[PDB]
């Protein structure tokens, strides 16, 4: 109808159901609008800023905001939130002594952040040497998403001043140098970052002076769940709005984990498979990492669902989700990046997850060279196994810093198994993997994924 | 009706009685609204800000305030009040000499506090070495309730500057080092903290510039009673509005201590039992600590009440209440965390406080290992005893720094007994507890609670 | 009609089709208006600022903006965007030691930029010595396009102060001088530049105080493609607005690469040939340099087009295009700047690209003196070859740092061939070029172009 409780130019009936923006006006969603390229939006009819960002639902949906904001933040359920961190490129120490850093700022959010003023800590071993706020020489005027300051091809900015105006960074005593010579080196971490956001005033100009991102950080972090996606080299962090559990007046729409991922990362869905930029981010092709609360919530909710899939679990406020695209992934259909081919593989099957499976009759042993491996790193080998007989056990031998010999009992249906090991030393013993089964098994989606060192 | 004396969008009749917020409008409370999850609110019809905070009754009730504010502060009788303290994580001294601290700020209130600027004192023994206000490098942009700055996983921020811009902390003379070498160490206490609160302006943005928390601290502290709850590791401080005694024009609603606790901490009530987060905070399961004025007020009011319970005493302005969840608690029904089982215990009874009691025929002696004990600490052993005969006396022997031998005369009904002792030295004599009675007694709710060292 | 969705004084029908400004009002475009000197403008009817600059479509089209802005930015599809860089004219080092620079700012954009405050890095070899922001003494009040500060005839401005107020630039230790004496010299690069833009207020005056160019840099860079033109001595950088691919609500007009170049550089078109300032910038007379993404996009789009020309490819958002006017260019019609004439050239032909071709029967060898050559530089020799027989192969011998002997198979129609070599040392061996073919070939548009050293 024409009822607007929160006065954001979108009718309450349109917000409760689907709606789309055409010619800068909101209209009812129709299933025939998807082939033209339109997207269906849903938002709370009792709140103008469903996601908690400075931009209302209408501004996000109609694209009436800064054009450097990523389109993923045009969804009213996805918050435009800059994530900025400081990377320490180089360290210089020279005479007490003086210390200097070459650093570069990174942005992994959905919104640009003007006037970047990071605050950093200098910690050697537990003890924090100094806390430094960015001075006038170390302030970035612009920082667009998926971009750095200084940009690519430019040297990292210098940091040598402790306080305002002119100052020199200096350890308090010779003990710092004494423990530096022993073999202890210095970290750098970011405690907070200050910056501005852009709005259009009554004169049509863009102002970024009185608009502070710190006025919305606590609000966004309290009404949303965090989803992080790592692709080995690039990382993307997103916040998705979720409804309150015990609040009856909370009208935030409810979406699942897969729907939230698709909304936050704008991943193309080809019927059922989900692709980010041609890289499959489907549930069975990636590693999912959760904290204790999210893990227990998902385990509790899974038993009440017949499908029993992570992507079908309703998103809830306070969730932290990490997605790790496997470094090595083979499915015997369209991708096999392993430098060395597997042993005793039969592709003549039709019982696989997507197209076919691997009919293993005996054992499979793989020799992985360490040239394409990262030393001093923890890895996880994951896979999907199928055994209708449920009478054969699989024993696995993994070569690592400590030799691992483990046993597994496959189930009737496809079951995921993951084994964690650690590799230390580049010029060390070669990594060997072996798995032997009593009879004939089905294997699919074998992955090697890096974890924290 | 439609009479609004204070002009806060809530009718006076609705405020005097119960009311609830539905579709952003206030409506009469109905007993059938509780099963939908709604809450009943009451507030003064002669004051827009009943609790004394910057947010009016309508804004609190309808949730038109900053979303990082805890839901306990959505009650008009509970004030959104940040409680911020500075914890001194590490101390570094090195050459006169120079001193540096690694500190972290903590928030235990219901509202976020922006631009945290604490003021701290450096006291060694009585004499205050220096008073330091937080500089630009030591200011926290955001500080959400139940969160720290820097957040978990980040090193504590450094403090080495005395005055504005650039300065070095330094003792005035060698006497400081002379008495430091003797074995005297340095404390750190917070005298005041400066910060901002968030409000939405006419343009829909959030501004935290001219909004100071110091404009409301004295007002809140003068029209409210303080309730603190300690759970061994976490502490929560709340302020609950109370009416003036001699003022006839004060229309603040009157609530009891149990109702105030439930409102302030959002504790679930399962008929009669009260739980915070699964931890029972019922009157008989926790330790209640009061100052002299509150103690005498409660003792005076108890004699005029037939029920004779602390939680049924009307809350009054100026009250200070402390709740300490017992470290060890046994009730013989659903909880027994004592590492060593009790002696001569008979659970076959039906005269207990909730389900059953302990039928002790003789004596009970418990040997508590000091591995799960805190040395150099004062402890209290509390319990509930019942003796219909009223002819048997109970003598208790408690091993501590000084051996305690005390006598008790149980009453006809259940009576609470508390004994205070001190344990000194980790590698000291083991703690022994014994209590002997002439005949058969009923024992329930035995608790061991830590006190100040 | 009279429908204005974005309220920029231009009807939507006029924006969708062509329109022109007459007597400060927008009117329908007519084909008879071109002979009077009028230009046809197109812009999005759903956005007031199609290009993303602080000036709306009407202000750009009608010339209601600062008069120092170049007329190329009067097109609503071309953004008024200043490009400012710092050129290091001289370096002085003298005693640790002190360092001073003589520098001059350059502007290669379409808009003037007031209050220029560049930020620069001092890098010797990887390590960044210091980052310096322009102080009060090094700020340029005005910087017009194609102009410098200080202007021509004035000495470059001095830079010797590191921080605010008064400071002296100084290396941290003697290691800087130690590696300077070895033969390592210092670069200077610009990380960012701050400045203002001019707008007219309600009183008719021009204000450049609160108008910051950093509020529009990220917006312009995200909705436009960059085109750079280098003419050996002068460089011009432009941004041309392009539409979003997947957005159905993006109404930005679509133009080709040649049309975009003509719009951005105001190049006169004499039917088909395109001239910048009498220098032909036609597709076959210049070198086109693309990044990987633009190269693959253009290759993909070319196969779907019958004409198969770069200038007919539709411009797309995110494109980076570089145009290099060849240093030496001969076409046997109206231009031959080679100091030494070619060998075995027959101009009696009528099958050339524009007027005639070169009928080569045998081989062509050219001796190019190094007096008009730049030592330690990489060069490219390009040309167009035609062979209807398609039975003769052409072998080329190029003298350089390494002697190059390459083979080529000409096609039936005109085909472009490019060969890259490097010349090192002014007092080195003379450069020789030779190319021999089995039979009779057609040669046209022979060019020598400088590349990066
Ligand atoms: Ca609405
Ligand atoms: Ca809404
Ligand atoms: Ca498969
Ligand atoms: Ca009222
Ligand atoms: Ca009121
Ligand atoms: Ca009991
Ligand atoms: Ca228009
Ligand atoms: Ca327009
Ligand atoms: Ca020609």
Short mmCIF file of C-alpha atoms in Angstrom, two decimals, chain A residues 112-350:
data_model
loop_
_atom_site.label_atom_id
_atom_site.label_comp_id
_atom_site.label_asym_id
_atom_site.label_seq_id
_atom_site.Cartn_x
_atom_site.Cartn_y
_atom_site.Cartn_z
CA UNK A 112 35.85 3.48 1.16
CA UNK A 113 37.30 5.15 4.24
CA UNK A 114 38.64 8.71 4.07
CA UNK A 115 41.28 10.24 6.37
CA UNK A 116 42.75 6.97 7.62
CA UNK A 117 44.39 7.41 11.05
CA UNK A 118 45.45 3.99 12.36
CA UNK A 119 46.73 3.38 15.88
CA UNK A 120 49.44 0.74 16.28
CA UNK A 121 51.34 -1.04 19.04
CA UNK A 122 55.03 -1.97 19.07
CA UNK A 123 55.38 -5.27 20.96
CA UNK A 124 58.63 -7.23 21.14
CA UNK A 125 57.73 -10.06 23.54
CA UNK A 126 54.58 -9.39 25.54
CA UNK A 127 55.78 -5.95 26.61
CA UNK A 128 54.36 -3.13 24.48
CA UNK A 129 57.18 -0.71 23.65
CA UNK A 130 55.03 2.17 22.38
CA UNK A 131 51.56 3.00 21.09
CA UNK A 132 51.64 5.35 18.09
CA UNK A 133 48.76 7.24 16.48
CA UNK A 134 49.13 8.23 12.83
CA UNK A 135 50.47 11.77 12.45
CA UNK A 136 49.85 14.21 9.60
CA UNK A 137 52.54 12.58 7.44
CA UNK A 138 51.01 9.09 7.79
CA UNK A 139 47.34 9.85 7.00
CA UNK A 140 45.73 8.38 3.89
CA UNK A 141 43.34 10.71 2.07
CA UNK A 142 41.50 7.88 0.29
CA UNK A 143 41.35 4.13 0.87
CA UNK A 144 39.03 2.27 -1.52
CA UNK A 145 37.98 -1.35 -0.89
CA UNK A 146 40.49 -3.95 -2.12
CA UNK A 147 43.12 -1.20 -2.37
CA UNK A 148 46.13 -0.08 -0.35
CA UNK A 149 47.82 3.16 0.70
CA UNK A 150 50.21 3.78 -0.89
CA UNK A 151 48.85 2.03 -3.98
CA UNK A 152 50.67 -0.70 -5.88
CA UNK A 153 54.00 0.35 -7.37
CA UNK A 154 54.67 2.86 -4.57
CA UNK A 155 57.01 2.35 -1.64
CA UNK A 156 55.48 1.79 1.82
CA UNK A 157 55.05 4.89 3.95
CA UNK A 158 57.58 5.64 6.68
CA UNK A 159 56.80 5.72 10.41
CA UNK A 160 59.44 7.11 12.77
CA UNK A 161 57.59 9.68 14.92
CA UNK A 162 56.08 8.75 18.30
CA UNK A 163 54.07 11.85 19.24
CA UNK A 164 52.51 14.89 17.58
CA UNK A 165 54.55 17.32 15.46
CA UNK A 166 58.19 16.18 15.56
CA UNK A 167 59.45 13.25 17.63
CA UNK A 168 61.85 10.31 17.32
CA UNK A 169 61.01 6.71 18.19
CA UNK A 170 63.52 5.32 20.67
CA UNK A 171 63.66 2.32 23.05
CA UNK A 172 63.72 3.27 26.72
CA UNK A 173 66.96 1.43 27.55
CA UNK A 174 69.69 -0.84 26.19
CA UNK A 175 67.73 -3.92 27.31
CA UNK A 176 65.64 -3.65 24.13
CA UNK A 177 68.77 -3.97 21.98
CA UNK A 178 70.12 -6.66 24.31
CA UNK A 179 67.08 -8.89 23.75
CA UNK A 180 66.94 -7.95 20.06
CA UNK A 181 70.46 -9.31 19.56
CA UNK A 182 69.50 -12.59 21.24
CA UNK A 183 67.11 -13.36 18.38
CA UNK A 184 63.83 -11.74 19.43
CA UNK A 185 62.07 -9.67 16.77
CA UNK A 186 59.25 -7.13 16.87
CA UNK A 187 55.58 -7.40 15.86
CA UNK A 188 53.12 -4.66 14.91
CA UNK A 189 49.37 -4.78 15.51
CA UNK A 190 46.55 -2.30 14.94
CA UNK A 191 44.32 -1.45 17.90
CA UNK A 192 41.97 0.96 16.12
CA UNK A 193 41.63 3.01 12.94
CA UNK A 194 39.97 6.41 12.52
CA UNK A 195 38.37 7.62 9.32
CA UNK A 196 35.43 9.29 7.62
CA UNK A 197 32.52 8.40 5.34
CA UNK A 198 30.93 10.41 2.54
CA UNK A 199 27.46 11.96 2.48
CA UNK A 200 25.78 14.43 0.14
CA UNK A 201 24.56 17.66 1.72
CA UNK A 202 21.75 20.00 0.64
CA UNK A 203 24.00 21.69 -1.95
CA UNK A 204 24.80 18.43 -3.75
CA UNK A 205 28.44 18.31 -2.65
CA UNK A 206 30.15 15.44 -0.82
CA UNK A 207 31.31 16.16 2.74
CA UNK A 208 33.58 13.87 4.78
CA UNK A 209 34.41 16.18 7.70
CA UNK A 210 31.98 15.52 10.55
CA UNK A 211 31.15 11.97 9.44
CA UNK A 212 33.02 9.51 11.67
CA UNK A 213 33.10 5.73 11.24
CA UNK A 214 33.55 5.27 15.00
CA UNK A 215 29.93 6.37 15.53
CA UNK A 216 28.69 3.19 13.82
CA UNK A 217 31.30 0.49 14.57
CA UNK A 218 29.74 -0.63 17.86
CA UNK A 219 26.24 -0.45 16.38
CA UNK A 220 27.17 -2.55 13.34
CA UNK A 221 29.14 -5.10 15.38
CA UNK A 222 26.15 -5.63 17.71
CA UNK A 223 23.36 -6.36 15.19
CA UNK A 224 25.28 -8.46 12.67
CA UNK A 225 27.25 -11.65 12.10
CA UNK A 226 30.76 -11.66 10.62
CA UNK A 227 31.67 -13.76 7.57
CA UNK A 228 35.28 -13.89 6.36
CA UNK A 229 36.42 -15.51 3.11
CA UNK A 230 40.09 -16.30 2.45
CA UNK A 231 41.36 -17.28 -1.01
CA UNK A 232 45.02 -17.88 -0.13
CA UNK A 233 46.11 -14.39 -1.20
CA UNK A 234 43.05 -12.14 -0.78
CA UNK A 235 40.68 -11.85 2.18
CA UNK A 236 37.17 -10.38 2.31
CA UNK A 237 35.33 -9.56 5.54
CA UNK A 238 31.59 -8.86 5.63
CA UNK A 239 28.89 -8.16 8.21
CA UNK A 240 25.35 -9.44 7.63
CA UNK A 241 22.43 -8.14 9.69
CA UNK A 242 20.55 -10.67 11.81
CA UNK A 243 17.46 -10.44 13.99
CA UNK A 244 17.34 -10.55 17.78
CA UNK A 245 16.21 -13.83 19.31
CA UNK A 246 13.99 -12.77 22.21
CA UNK A 247 12.82 -9.46 20.73
CA UNK A 248 9.27 -9.64 19.30
CA UNK A 249 9.61 -6.15 17.79
CA UNK A 250 12.67 -7.09 15.70
CA UNK A 251 11.52 -7.36 12.08
CA UNK A 252 14.88 -8.14 10.47
CA UNK A 253 14.41 -10.78 7.74
CA UNK A 254 15.78 -14.27 8.38
CA UNK A 255 18.20 -15.85 5.89
CA UNK A 256 20.35 -18.96 5.81
CA UNK A 257 24.14 -19.26 5.81
CA UNK A 258 24.36 -19.94 2.08
CA UNK A 259 21.98 -17.09 1.28
CA UNK A 260 23.98 -14.80 3.58
CA UNK A 261 27.23 -15.77 1.83
CA UNK A 262 25.68 -15.18 -1.60
CA UNK A 263 24.35 -11.78 -0.50
CA UNK A 264 27.60 -10.69 1.16
CA UNK A 265 30.01 -11.78 -1.59
CA UNK A 266 27.73 -11.47 -4.67
CA UNK A 267 28.49 -15.07 -5.61
CA UNK A 268 26.89 -16.34 -8.80
CA UNK A 269 24.57 -19.31 -8.30
CA UNK A 270 24.29 -21.70 -11.25
CA UNK A 271 21.23 -23.55 -10.01
CA UNK A 272 22.89 -25.12 -6.98
CA UNK A 273 26.64 -24.51 -7.31
CA UNK A 274 28.01 -21.23 -5.95
CA UNK A 275 31.00 -19.44 -7.49
CA UNK A 276 32.76 -16.31 -6.23
CA UNK A 277 34.84 -15.33 -9.28
CA UNK A 278 34.98 -18.71 -10.97
CA UNK A 279 36.33 -20.25 -7.75
CA UNK A 280 33.71 -22.61 -6.26
CA UNK A 281 32.74 -21.64 -2.72
CA UNK A 282 30.22 -24.45 -2.35
CA UNK A 283 29.82 -26.14 1.04
CA UNK A 284 31.61 -29.33 -0.03
CA UNK A 285 34.48 -27.50 -1.78
CA UNK A 286 35.66 -25.21 1.06
CA UNK A 287 36.75 -25.45 4.68
CA UNK A 288 34.39 -23.99 7.29
CA UNK A 289 35.85 -22.69 10.56
CA UNK A 290 33.67 -21.65 13.49
CA UNK A 291 34.14 -20.54 17.08
CA UNK A 292 32.76 -22.59 19.98
CA UNK A 293 29.41 -20.79 20.25
CA UNK A 294 28.67 -20.94 16.52
CA UNK A 295 29.83 -24.56 16.38
CA UNK A 296 27.50 -25.65 19.19
CA UNK A 297 24.61 -23.61 17.76
CA UNK A 298 25.05 -25.21 14.33
CA UNK A 299 25.34 -28.70 15.82
CA UNK A 300 22.16 -28.15 17.84
CA UNK A 301 20.25 -26.80 14.83
CA UNK A 302 21.47 -29.49 12.42
CA UNK A 303 19.78 -32.36 14.28
CA UNK A 304 16.38 -30.66 13.86
CA UNK A 305 16.83 -30.37 10.07
CA UNK A 306 16.34 -33.26 7.65
CA UNK A 307 18.74 -32.01 4.96
CA UNK A 308 21.63 -31.66 7.46
CA UNK A 309 23.67 -29.04 5.60
CA UNK A 310 25.55 -26.07 7.02
CA UNK A 311 24.32 -23.69 4.30
CA UNK A 312 20.69 -24.40 5.26
CA UNK A 313 21.14 -23.22 8.87
CA UNK A 314 19.43 -19.92 9.63
CA UNK A 315 21.86 -17.07 10.24
CA UNK A 316 21.86 -15.73 13.80
CA UNK A 317 23.22 -12.62 15.49
CA UNK A 318 26.71 -13.00 16.92
CA UNK A 319 27.96 -15.64 14.48
CA UNK A 320 31.57 -15.74 13.27
CA UNK A 321 32.16 -17.77 10.10
CA UNK A 322 35.45 -18.35 8.27
CA UNK A 323 35.68 -19.87 4.79
CA UNK A 324 39.02 -21.19 3.51
CA UNK A 325 39.19 -22.10 -0.17
CA UNK A 326 41.36 -25.25 -0.29
CA UNK A 327 44.82 -24.80 -1.77
CA UNK A 328 44.70 -28.22 -3.45
CA UNK A 329 41.35 -29.60 -4.58
CA UNK A 330 40.48 -32.61 -6.73
CA UNK A 331 37.01 -33.90 -7.58
CA UNK A 332 37.78 -36.04 -10.69
CA UNK A 333 35.32 -33.97 -12.76
CA UNK A 334 36.73 -30.55 -13.70
CA UNK A 335 39.62 -29.67 -11.36
CA UNK A 336 42.83 -31.41 -10.27
CA UNK A 337 45.69 -29.12 -9.21
CA UNK A 338 47.83 -31.80 -7.55
CA UNK A 339 51.30 -31.82 -9.17
CA UNK A 340 51.50 -35.62 -8.75
CA UNK A 341 48.68 -37.83 -9.99
CA UNK A 342 46.92 -40.18 -7.58
CA UNK A 343 47.40 -43.95 -7.54
CA UNK A 344 44.77 -46.62 -8.28
CA UNK A 345 42.01 -44.28 -9.47
CA UNK A 346 38.95 -45.45 -11.42
CA UNK A 347 36.72 -42.69 -12.79
CA UNK A 348 34.04 -45.06 -14.15
CA UNK A 349 31.28 -44.33 -11.64
CA UNK A 350 27.95 -42.55 -11.32
#
